[PDB]
Design a protein around this nucleic acid. Structure first.
Ligand SMILES: [Zn+2]
Ligand SMILES: [Zn+2]
Ligand SMILES: [Zn+2]
Ligand SMILES: [Zn+2]
Ligand SMILES: [Zn+2]
Ligand SMILES: [Zn+2]
Length: 168
DNA sequence: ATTGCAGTACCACATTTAACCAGCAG
DNA sequence: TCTGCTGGTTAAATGTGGTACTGCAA
């Protein structure tokens, strides 16, 4: 199918689309009257505001918040007020978590320890991350953390680092 | 010197979603 | 030709999560 584009030899089925390629490469508007976005093609602006800016009859709720919105753009934009913010406040105590998983663990301290070692009568509140009890006690290598140059060893980086600050 | 615990930092992997783009009917 | 739609394709942001790390207080 013709017709080849002269500067760059597309490759287009119909002339109108080819001239569209000359316009795109080979720029253009358009700016959504309501939001600050810009769209390549006008028809794509059409879809943008048939999807972001149509009145939704039953409002949607924020994932983190109690705000409802009847506009999609308004809804997402709001969820912005929640990004990189502590979005999971805790009812019993004033601790807040950016991620829910953490909120669940914190809860456990208030609502008491369902992780249990197979080999021992030990229950760990947090997730497996405390089944590293398993590595230490049911014992397949603690980390060295060597200082320089005194060559001393520490079981923890931070302590070693502090020591390294003033050593000879 | 240390460790366990609660909670954070870091960094990688999986998901979503909104514009792109070609082609099309009217 | 011209205009407005589409469905499927493409990446950037964000959710998800593993884990090493930390600060605190035994
Ligand atoms: Zn060209
Ligand atoms: Zn808009
Ligand atoms: Zn909200
Ligand atoms: Zn709490
Ligand atoms: Zn055990
Ligand atoms: Zn040293």
């Amino acid at each position: 199918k013709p017709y080849e584009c002269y500067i760059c030899h597309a490759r287009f089925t119909q002339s109108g689309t080819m001239k569209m390629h000359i316009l795109q490469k080979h720029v253009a508007k358009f700016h959504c009257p309501h939001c600050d976005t810009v769209i390549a093609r006008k028809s794509d602006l059409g879809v943008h505001l048939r999807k972001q800016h149509s009145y939704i009859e039953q409002g949607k709720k924020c994932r983190y918040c109690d705000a409802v919105f009847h506009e999609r753009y308004a809804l997402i934009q709001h969820q912005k007020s929640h990004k990189n913010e502590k979005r999971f406040k805790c009812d019993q105590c004033d601790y807040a978590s950016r991620q829910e998983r953490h909120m669940i663990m914190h809860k456990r301290t208030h609502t008491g320890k369902p992780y249990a070692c197979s080999h021992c009568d030990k229950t760990f509140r947090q997730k497996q991350l405390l089944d590293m009890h398993f590595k230490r006690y049911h014992d397949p290598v603690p980390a060295a953390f060597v200082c320089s140059k005194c060559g001393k060893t520490f079981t923890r980086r931070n302590t070693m680092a502090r020591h390294a600050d003033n050593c000879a």
